[PDB]
Curated annotation (Swiss-Prot), chains A, C:
Organism annotation: Homo sapiens
Coiled-coil spans in chain: none
Recorded consequence of changing S59L: In DFNA64; does not increase apoptotic activity compared to wild-type; enhances the degradation of mutant and wild-type protein via heterodimerization; cells expressing the mutant protein show increased susceptibility to calcium-induced loss of mitochondrial potential compared to wild-type, indicating increased sensitivity to mitochondrial stress and suggestive of mitochondrial dysfunction
Domain of life assignment: Eukaryota
Portion of the full sequence shown: 68 to 217 of 239
Name this protein carries in UniProt: Diablo IAP-binding mitochondrial protein, cleaved form
Curated annotation (Swiss-Prot), chains B, D:
Name of the protein in its database record: Dual E2 ubiquitin-conjugating enzyme/E3 ubiquitin-protein ligase BIRC6
Tissues where this protein is expressed: Expressed in brain cancer cells.
Gene designation per UniProt: BIRC6
Signal peptide (UniProt feature, chain positions): none
Span list, region HRRAR loop: 28-32
Residues of the full protein shown: 3162 to 3238 of 4857
Family membership noted in the UniProt record: Belongs to the BIRC6 family.
Species assigned in the record: Homo sapiens
Record's function text: Anti-apoptotic protein known as inhibitor of apoptosis (IAP) which can regulate cell death by controlling caspases and by acting as an E3 ubiquitin-protein ligase. Unlike most IAPs, does not contain a RING domain and it is not a RING-type E3 ligase. Instead acts as a dual E2/E3 enzyme that combines ubiquitin conjugating (E2) and ubiquitin ligase (E3) activities in a single polypeptide. Ubiquitination is mediated by a non-canonical E1 ubiquitin activating enzyme UBA6.
Subunit structure: Homodimer; antiparallel. Interacts with RNF41. Interacts with DIABLO/SMAC, likely with higher affinity to SMAC dimer than SMAC monomer; this interaction blocks the substrate-binding site and inhibits the caspase inhibition activity of BIRC6. Interacts with KIF23/MKLP1, USP8/UBPY, BIRC5/survivin, MAP2K1/MEK1, RAB8A/RAB8, RAB11A/RAB11, PLK1, EXOC3/SEC6 and EXOC4/SEC8.
Length: 150, 77, 150, 77
């Protein structure tokens, strides 16, 4: 016999699950881009308040903003403790995707090879684009620094 | 081992922080990037890592592990 | 997310790495069993060709057959040892899949669970049939070598 | 390049045949396995590889590409 029907209903369940997963990941990508932009803007806004507004106000607010800097730095480290695992999970995702591309090229499944190549390319584009928004904000911060210094 | 208790530093101002090298746990076997990387200037031949310890110890052996993924980046000497 | 969810994500990273390793080992095992079976089949085909060319035995081809028989004794012991070691490695891979499935079931994936169950039953049938065929191949080779006396 | 036109043989009888080394196209840049592998016996220190050409050739250069995935297996000399 041929296992084509077995593969057919297996991948039918897989495609239903991954269509639900694709809608869920569209929603979760909206959530993730929102959270990532909020975190980057929080970092840059606290840097801006650290650099731009020292000495204009009185002494009590000076001590207040200093304690705010200390506490917010601690809380930002605590919140950013989640981002260290994102790099490693993207590392393992990239490795697994490259393995899938190689294995599908080896087996010869053209649809699976295209799926794995576009999988690594798409995860690369998504992670590099959220990181690209972050580094665009960082580059804007550096440009504002070099223009403010000179 | 006394590396974790020490503080590592380099004489090259552009060198990345090397405190990751003193941990007891090595990284993933085929990690795409080495734990610590140094960028050699075209005229520079030697880079130095200076580990400082809190107190004098009777040193016996030194172990250095290169990046097993790419041995091409292993130091020559 | 939570502490249990953080443990889930950490074990997800660990199990994704070990599942990359497990996929590599399992594909290597499948290819090794394929080479096993194809080497046995090629040796049997060469022996059948020599038997089909009977009557015109010469020094060159009979010396080749003697070398084939010596290498066939060496291959018998090597095939037995590598069958033992491949069964042991398949048991290790099954244990790795077992712990990966435990992690996934503690995660809460059900579509993955049913797909894995269907895959397990299908590959159980397939490996049972192919291993029975292989063991029968070496059993027939050993019987032929034994009856070569008469 | 005259490597494809030649036949490569090794002195050790147990050596795996190395005709794959003469392919005119290089293998994958990050291939997960080596095209040709030799296993050294404990008493052995030198490996043998002889390339025979159909006719005399004014040889100028020899290029050897080690298995770049794991450079620890690159020949010492």
């Amino acid at each position: 016999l041929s296992s084509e029907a077995l593969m057919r209903r297996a991948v039918s369940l897989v495609t239903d699950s991954t269509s639900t997963f694709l809608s869920q990941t569209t929603y979760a990508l909206i959530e993730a881009i929102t959270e990532y932009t909020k975190a980057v803007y929080t970092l840059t806004s606290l840097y801006r308040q650290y650099t731009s507004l020292l000495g204009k106000m009185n002494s009590e607010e000076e001590d207040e903003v200093w304690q705010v800097i200390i506490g917010a730095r601690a809380e930002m480290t605590s919140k950013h403790q989640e981002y260290l695992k994102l790099e490693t999970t993207w590392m393992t995702a990239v490795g697994l995707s490259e393995m899938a591309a190689e294995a599908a090229y080896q087996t010869g499944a053209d649809q699976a090879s295209i799926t794995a190549r576009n999988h690594i390319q798409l995860v690369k584009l998504q992670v590099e684009e959220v990181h690209q928004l972050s580094r665009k904000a960082e580059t804007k911060l550096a440009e504002a620094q070099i223009e403010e210094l000179r | 081992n006394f590396a974790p208790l020490g503080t590592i530093t380099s004489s090259s101002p552009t060198a990345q922080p090397a405190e990751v090298l003193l941990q007891a746990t090595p990284p993933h076997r085929r990690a795409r990037s080495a734990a610590w990387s140094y960028i050699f200037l075209p005229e520079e031949a030697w880079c130095d890592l200076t580990i400082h310890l809190p107190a004098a110890v009777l040193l016996k052996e030194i172990h250095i592990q290169p990046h097993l993924a790419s041995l091409a980046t292993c130091p020559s000497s």
